Design an enzyme around this catalytic site. Structure first.
Site, PDB file in Angstrom:
ATOM      1  N   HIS A  81       0.812  -1.210   0.000  1.00  0.00           N
ATOM      2  CA  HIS A  81       0.000   0.000   0.000  1.00  0.00           C
ATOM      3  C   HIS A  81       0.847   1.262   0.000  1.00  0.00           C
ATOM      4  O   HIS A  81       1.043   1.887  -1.048  1.00  0.00           O
ATOM      5  CB  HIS A  81      -0.933   0.012   1.210  1.00  0.00           C
ATOM      6  N   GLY A 129       5.272   1.823  -2.741  1.00  0.00           N
ATOM      7  CA  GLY A 129       3.886   2.167  -2.510  1.00  0.00           C
ATOM      8  C   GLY A 129       3.593   3.580  -2.980  1.00  0.00           C
ATOM      9  O   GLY A 129       4.483   4.305  -3.427  1.00  0.00           O
ATOM     10  N   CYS A 130       2.326   3.950  -2.866  1.00  0.00           N
ATOM     11  CA  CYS A 130       1.916   5.290  -3.253  1.00  0.00           C
ATOM     12  C   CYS A 130       2.390   6.299  -2.216  1.00  0.00           C
ATOM     13  O   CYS A 130       2.134   6.141  -1.018  1.00  0.00           O
ATOM     14  CB  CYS A 130       0.401   5.360  -3.416  1.00  0.00           C
ATOM     15  N   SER A 131       3.070   7.343  -2.687  1.00  0.00           N
ATOM     16  CA  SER A 131       3.628   8.391  -1.835  1.00  0.00           C
ATOM     17  C   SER A 131       4.505   7.796  -0.737  1.00  0.00           C
ATOM     18  O   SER A 131       4.449   8.195   0.426  1.00  0.00           O
ATOM     19  CB  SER A 131       2.525   9.270  -1.247  1.00  0.00           C
ATOM     20  N   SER A 132       5.334   6.828  -1.123  1.00  0.00           N
ATOM     21  CA  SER A 132       6.179   6.137  -0.158  1.00  0.00           C
ATOM     22  C   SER A 132       7.248   7.056   0.408  1.00  0.00           C
ATOM     23  O   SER A 132       7.506   7.044   1.616  1.00  0.00           O
ATOM     24  CB  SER A 132       6.818   4.918  -0.813  1.00  0.00           C
TER      25      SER A 132
END
Lengths: 56, 1445
Positions: free
Chosen positions: B1328, B1353-1356
């Site tokens: 995620h 992940g998104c905006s990791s």
């Protein structure tokens, strides 16, 4: 025509849990008890056992 | 001589001997001896011989003397007519003995004297027994006096011999044992059938004699015989229950019993000792309620000692049981005395007190009007014993029921005039304990609520419950009762004034906790009044110390000096070399250090404080010492918050060498210590059990005060996460205790902390909660009810009127925000003035010098700041120069304290003067910078460094670079300092050189003494000298001309090893494209992405994706072209080969001729190292900028130089670390065309590169030194089970890899993910976000980070920027924990495209072979995913380049 892929947005700030380190935790303790009232000896009898000479 | 003549001859011979004695003659005695020798023929002859022997003994004044004494006794024995003559003779013999007190007597001489005395006693007793002796009252008295006179002399000889008796002569004392006990027998018989007055007076001396006789053995550890000596008297005196000896001094009777009870108790025999105390009280049967106290103390002493020996059966033997037949009232008073004496001991006597109180309740008849009083008093004592350890096996009455029954009984009582004082006392004490046990009820109710688990606005409005009026009123009335009792000046006449003192202490502690400081002040004044009345200077000194600490917590430091002097005066009267004196002396020293701190005499204060800090008495294990260390740490934090010009340099070094480098560290250690105290209270051998009760309500008040300090400080620094953590902890505590005022304070604090993060909704929720709580607290100009009278409530109200104006300005109302701020401007002065008048009336002084500068000064300073920041946006040339001048003056009167606000006001003044003046701005801002350099506000420090590096530039190269370097990642610097201190603490507690070195590297006051820019520049030159080889550091920073805006001018500062710092200013404020517009376009792209990903039409979906990718690539191209422009080779490597340097020299000279000010060589050396890729328009802009006066030939010369330098090579081994601001970190600089072939990573601040180097020097960073291993990798594939498209393919390839131990489909346990970061080299997270749920920032910061973190992940790797606060994200916690490399996305990405990217990266890097650069394969894998700019430019790396091993 490629199918639609997934998209799971994530805010990078949703990671913070405002938890302190367990040496700073006070409110989860059982603050129960009132530990008595000690009123120290007003008179120290320790120095009440001396008469020395049989004064008339 | 005839019988009568012989009798007259005896009288004459006695007269002759008396005549010899009359002149103490010896030759005359010899003449009388000759006359006696002439009379030698009778019964009187032996008597005359004894007188002659006495004269010879007097002449002797050794063994012969002892033999003579025995010889006298022997002849006297035969004589005892002759016995009558022997008396007069024995008197003469005793007269010689009276003059024979050579003190050099041995048991043998004493035994011989005992023989003579016993013989005389036998004859004297027989003579007295003779009816004739008794018949004459005086004659019997005369013989009686003679016997007692002889006994008095005997005990004198015994005590003289006992004094002569030493350790060796103890055997001799054991020899005299016989005569001593026999003596007591004779004395008692002498008291037989005696007239009252004669008997009582003789009883006094009789007891006195044996008291002296018994004491001798007791004074030499011989209790057995000492007891044998006193046994007869004690039994006889105790048995005669009839009070036939009312006159006999109780003082004497006491001594004899006291001795026997101690002799038995010092030899165990607790049972016999108990019976002796019963016999003691039997003797004092009809005595006053005063003499009975000492026996009762001895009872409790024998009882407590019994417990030590396991004599639990002594507790079974109770007084009511033992004293069976005693007048009720007398037994009730005796059990009261036993209760008090139990209250005097220190060894868990709760059950014993409970037994005494139960028996007192059973004995006190509720029927009598004088029994209702005793009922109520024993009930408040039962409440005291029940709020401690409630007894569910007895009574069946609750504590809050017992106390209410007691209060009703007291309301039913009516006193006369002598007992009204006792009535006020017990009523006030009942009200105090009513409050205490209602609070305990609340605590257990909350405990039950939280225990209810089975298998917060609402909470606040529920806990309020409108119950404050019920509980606080009872303490407000207990105070008034104590005050009417103790203010009259006359004697109190209460039961135990010590109990009044302890109750006043508890009441002051409770008021401090409910946040009513003025009431606690009044209570402490009354405690000082009572403490003088009781001659206890420990308590007077403590009360003065507390009054001083509470006056310093408020504004007025003038009144604190009076009470500190009073505390010292009371300290004079103490023993010293005693923990009480040591503690009160250290406390007074601390208070004087704080008085110096507030009086601006800081160097003497620091001397005092360092004297306190280096005392070995401050570290001994006891709770009062821990409270003192808490106050010490808060004072150390108050001294660490001063600028460095206030103190000397070695003073700062020795102050920081104690272990606390910032006020934040000192305050969190204060908080930790405050918690460790509570673990000791709410649990030892009860040694420190003396002050536990008062300490239990002092520790909570101090916890809330420490939390207010630790929240108002960390929020002004911009660290709002930790500030909100402490604020929530304190709110939880305050809702547990159900205190409205403290929770109102902390809710207003949380509201300000949420306004800092631009959360108007949560802030408005908290504001409505505090408005509800304040409407609750008030009892519904000069007086606004309970709000105005209290300082804390006026403070919370003005903080409300401040955070509400902040919110009203955030949403954009202006006029309303300004009106609220102007209300806060008129509020603090009047509040301080009313607090001044209230404090003066409470302490009763005259004219307090200057108003009270408490927190009202800080909130008025913040109002001045926020009111000066709004004159910039409305520059109407009016109330802007009149609101900033007043603010500057205000903040300039209190110089060492309000320093962040003076720095803010100086920055605003500089920005107003911006539009010689440049030098004026520079000096003003340098004042401000030195004002906040020691502990910066993070948001002000950036604006101040970058404005000062924009005015001062190229006119001072190193200084300009240093300011740009410190304007980035200030909050991360604070957090790293705090984390390093915690690391030192835990590492010391578990069982470090690199830790201390990193601490010195990040320290804010590791500088030398200097003027404005010099010591800073020297430390910066050292840091520059510390850079490793092959690394270029470009610090891009946005110069913001307003607080709260974005800005346009890009400050670019390049840092190399052996090169001067090359800085440049790129004013992108007219370049059409701007940089504000670039950030707006990036935000628009990220908003459109999420607004498009909701559509379900695949064709429109893909169309929107393509349009966003085209927009993104346009943005990336624009960054390089317009944002950097010509000044874009500053990010490229430097040419090792010669060529750029020589041309640099020539061009330097020739362009300096053309009009190039500030000519420099390294700039041209790095700008010509990339001449191969330099375009003619870059050369055009560069020339027309460097040399404006004669630009054309500058271009021609530059063209010739680049044409001559056409063929070149950038260094193979090289690396670029980009240090970006909080606003430019979101742009994807790593994907610009220029930097695509180049390795490029990011770091928070330049100091982190040096930190990585320092760690590499010592180890603990295997990957950044050795290399990542292909095996040894933990993966988390799809833990939430959402993404199965990835899950299948990634499962296949991951399982195909050797040595990879990971999870798939399931959420990993925190333990195995901890081991994943710690024990592995790679952590491939395919899911995620950035772990977050199973691994959050605190869990990794608590951990060492050995592994590379490939978080896909998104905006990791994104940092969330909220408000005027700097970016926050888990990558910061990863690289603060030692992560060598952290790869992660920068904005939201999609599923299969990011899977393609990850697959390319893992197939390229892994499998390439040993020594494969990872940063090479992040750009090689950036061309695999389809949308090459929308989900290819997202992956970003933080750290140092890594390579596979």
């Amino acid at each position: 025509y490629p199918e639609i892929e997934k998209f799971f947005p994530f805010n990078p700030l949703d990671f913070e849990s405002f938890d302190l380190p367990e040496e700073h935790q006070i409110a989860h303790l059982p603050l129960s008890g009132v530990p008595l009232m000690i009123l120290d000896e007003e008179r120290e009898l320790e120095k009440l056992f001396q008469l020395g000479p049989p004064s008339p | 001589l005839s019988p009568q003549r012989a009798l007259c001859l005896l009288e004459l011979t006695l007269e002759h001997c008396r005549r010899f004695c009359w002149s103490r003659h010896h030759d005359k005695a010899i003449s009388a001896v000759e006359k006696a020798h002439s009379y030698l023929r009778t019964n009187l002859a032996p008597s005359l011989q004894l007188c002659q022997l006495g004269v010879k003994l007097l002449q002797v004044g050794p063994q012969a003397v002892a033999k003579l004494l025995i010889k006298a006794s022997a002849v006297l024995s035969k004589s005892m007519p002759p016995l009558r003559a022997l008396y007069e003779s024995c008197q003469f013999f005793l007269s010689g003995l009276e003059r024979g007190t050579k003190r050099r007597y041995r048991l043998d001489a004493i035994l011989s004297l005992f023989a003579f005395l016993g013989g005389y006693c036998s004859l004297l007793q027989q003579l007295r027994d003779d009816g004739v002796y008794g018949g004459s009252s005086k004659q019997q008295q005369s013989f009686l006096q003679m016997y007692f006179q002889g006994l008095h002399l005997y005990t004198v000889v015994v005590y003289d011999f006992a004094q002569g008796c030493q350790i060796v002569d103890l055997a001799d004392l054991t020899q005299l044992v016989d005569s001593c006990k026999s003596t007591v027998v004779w004395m008692l018989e002498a008291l037989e059938g005696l007239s009252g007055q004669e008997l009582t007076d003789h009883m006094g001396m009789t007891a006195s004699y044996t008291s002296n006789l018994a004491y001798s053995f007791y004074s030499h550890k011989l209790y057995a015989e000492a007891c044998a000596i006193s046994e007869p008297l004690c039994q006889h005196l105790g048995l005669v229950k009839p009070g036939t000896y009312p006159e006999v001094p109780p003082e004497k009777l006491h001594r004899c019993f006291r001795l026997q009870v101690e002799s038995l108790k010092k030899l165990g025999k607790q049972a016999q000792g108990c019976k002796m105390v019963i016999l003691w009280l039997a003797a004092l049967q009809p005595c006053s309620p005063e003499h009975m106290a000492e026996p009762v103390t001895f009872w409790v002493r024998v009882k407590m000692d019994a417990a030590r020996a396991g004599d639990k059966e002594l507790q079974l033997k109770t007084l009511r049981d033992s004293l069976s037949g005693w007048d009720p009232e007398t037994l009730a008073l005796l059990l009261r005395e036993e209760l008090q004496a139990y209250k005097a001991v220190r060894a868990d006597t709760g059950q014993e007190r409970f037994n005494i109180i139960c028996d007192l309740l059973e004995l006190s008849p509720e029927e009598t009007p004088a029994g209702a009083w005793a009922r109520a008093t024993h009930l408040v004592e039962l409440a005291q014993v029940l709020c401690y350890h409630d007894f569910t096996q007895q009574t069946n009455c609750s504590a809050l029921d017992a106390i209410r029954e007691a209060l009703q009984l007291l309301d039913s009582v009516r006193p006369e005039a002598q007992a009204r004082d006792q009535l006020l006392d017990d009523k006030a004490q009942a009200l105090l304990w009513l409050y205490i046990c209602t609070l305990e009820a609340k605590i257990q109710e909350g405990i039950e609520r939280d225990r209810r688990a089975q298998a917060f606005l609402y909470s606040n409005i529920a806990f309020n419950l409108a119950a404050d009026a019920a509980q606080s009123k009872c303490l407000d009335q207990a105070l008034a009762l104590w005050k009417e009792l103790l203010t009259k000046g006359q004697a109190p006449a209460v039961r135990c004034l010590q109990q009044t003192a302890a109750s006043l202490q508890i009441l002051a502690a409770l008021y401090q906790l409910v946040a009513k400081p003025m009431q606690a002040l009044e209570v402490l004044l009354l405690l000082r009044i009572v403490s003088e009345r009781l001659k206890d200077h420990s308590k007077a000194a403590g009360s003065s110390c507390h009054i001083t600490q509470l006056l310093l917590t408020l504004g007025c430091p003038s009144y604190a000096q009076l009470h500190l002097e009073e505390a010292a005066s009371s300290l004079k009267h103490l023993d010293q070399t005693t923990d009480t004196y040591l503690l009160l002396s250290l406390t007074c020293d601390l208070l004087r250090s704080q008085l110096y701190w507030t009086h601006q005499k800081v160097t003497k204060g620091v001397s005092l404080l360092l004297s306190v800090l280096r005392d070995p008495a401050l570290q001994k294990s006891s709770k009062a010492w821990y409270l003192l260390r808490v106050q010490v740490l808060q004072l150390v934090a108050a001294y660490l918050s001063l600028p460095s010009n206030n103190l000397s340099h070695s003073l700062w070094e020795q102050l920081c060498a104690q272990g606390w480098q910032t006020p934040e560290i000192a305050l969190i250690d204060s908080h930790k210590l405050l918690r460790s105290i509570i673990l000791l209270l709410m649990g030892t051998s009860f040694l420190d059990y003396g002050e536990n009760l008062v300490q239990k309500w002092q520790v909570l008040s101090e916890v809330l005060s420490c939390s207010e300090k630790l929240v108002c400080h960390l929020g002004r620094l911009g660290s709002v996460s930790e500030a909100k953590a402490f604020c929530l902890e304190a709110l939880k505590l305050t809702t547990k205790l159900q205190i409205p005022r403290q929770c109102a304070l902390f809710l207003v604090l949380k509201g300000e902390l949420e306004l800092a993060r631009n959360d108007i909704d949560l802030c408005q929720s908290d504001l409505q909660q505090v408005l509800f709580l304040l409407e609750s607290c008030t009892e519904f100009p000069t007086c606004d009810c309970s709000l105005c009278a209290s300082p804390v409530l006026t403070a919370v109200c003005l903080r409300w009127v401040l955070v509400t104006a902040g919110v009203r300005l955030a949403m954009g109302h202006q006029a309303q925000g300004l009106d609220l701020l102007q209300v806060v401007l008129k509020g603090c002065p009047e509040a301080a003035e009313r607090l001044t008048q209230a404090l003066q009336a409470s302490l009763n002084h005259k004219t307090p010098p200057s108003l009270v500068p408490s927190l009202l000064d800080e909130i008025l300073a913040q109002a001045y700041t926020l009111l000066a920041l709004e004159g910039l946006n409305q520059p109407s040339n009016e109330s802007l120069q009149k609101v900033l001048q007043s603010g500057l003056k205000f903040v300039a009167a209190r110089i060492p304290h309000l320093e962040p606000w003076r720095a803010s006001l100086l920055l605003i003044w500089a920005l107003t003067k911006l539009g010689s003046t440049l030098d004026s701005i520079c000096d003003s801002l340098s004042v401000a910078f030195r004002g906040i350099s020691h502990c910066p506000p993070s948001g002000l420090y950036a604006h101040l460094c970058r404005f000062l590096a924009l005015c001062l530039g190229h006119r001072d190269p190193y200084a300009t670079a240093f300011l740009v370097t410190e304007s980035v990642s200030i909050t991360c610097r604070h957090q790293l300092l705090t984390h390093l201190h915690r690391q030192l603490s835990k590492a010391q507690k578990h069982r470090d050189v690199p830790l201390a070195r990193i601490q010195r590297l990040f320290s804010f006051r590791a500088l030398e003494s200097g003027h404005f820019p010099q010591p800073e520049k020297e430390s910066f030159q050292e840091r520059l000298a510390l850079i490793p080889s092959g690394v270029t550091v470009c610090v891009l920073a946005l110069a913001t001309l307003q607080p709260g805006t974005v800005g346009n001018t890009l400050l670019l500062t390049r840092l190399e090893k052996d090169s001067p710092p090359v800085s440049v200013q790129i004013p992108t404020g007219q370049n059409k494209l701007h940089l504000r517009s670039v950030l707006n376009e990036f935000d628009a792209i990220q908003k459109a992405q999420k607004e498009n990903s909701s559509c379900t039409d695949k064709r429109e979906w893909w169309t929107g994706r393509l349009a966003l990718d085209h927009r993104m690539e346009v943005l990336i191209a624009s960054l390089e072209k317009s944002v950097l422009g010509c000044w874009k080779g500053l990010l490229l490597p430097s040419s090792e080969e010669p060529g750029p340097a020589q041309e640099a020299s020539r061009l330097q000279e020739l362009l300096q001729d053309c009009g190039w000010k500030y000519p420099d060589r390294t700039l041209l050396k790095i700008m010509l190292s990339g001449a191969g890729a330099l375009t003619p328009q870059d050369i055009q802009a560069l020339a027309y900028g460097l040399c404006p006066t004669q630009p054309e030939r500058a271009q021609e010369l530059l063209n010739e130089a680049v044409g001559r330098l056409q063929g070149l090579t950038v260094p193979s081994n090289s690396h670029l670390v980009l240090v970006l601001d909080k606003d430019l970190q979101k742009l994807p600089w790593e994907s610009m065309p220029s930097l695509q072939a180049l390795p490029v990573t990011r770091l928070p601040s330049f100091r982190f590169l040096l930190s990585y180097s320092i760690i590499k020097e010592y180890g603990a960073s295997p990957v950044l030194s050795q290399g990542v291993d292909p095996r040894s990798t933990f993966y988390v594939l799809n833990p939430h089970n959402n993404l199965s498209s990835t899950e299948e393919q990634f499962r296949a390839n991951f399982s195909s890899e050797a040595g990879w131990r990971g999870v798939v489909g399931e959420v990993p346990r925190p333990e195995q993910v901890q081991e994943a970061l710690t024990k592995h080299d790679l952590y491939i997270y395919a899911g995620h976000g950035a772990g977050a749920r199973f691994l959050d920032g605190q869990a990794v910061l608590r951990l060492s980070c050995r592994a590379v973190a490939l978080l896909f992940g998104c905006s990791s790797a994104a940092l969330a920027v909220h408000g005027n606060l700097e970016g926050a994200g888990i990558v910061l916690k990863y690289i603060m924990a030692g992560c060598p490399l952290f790869l992660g996305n920068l904005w939201d990405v999609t599923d299969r495209d990011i899977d393609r990217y990850t697959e390319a990266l893992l197939q390229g890097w892994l499998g390439a072979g040993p020594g494969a650069p990872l940063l090479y394969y992040v750009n090689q894998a950036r061309q695999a995913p389809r949308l090459k700019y929308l989900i290819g430019a997202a992956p970003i790396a933080y750290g140092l380049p890594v390579s596979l091993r």
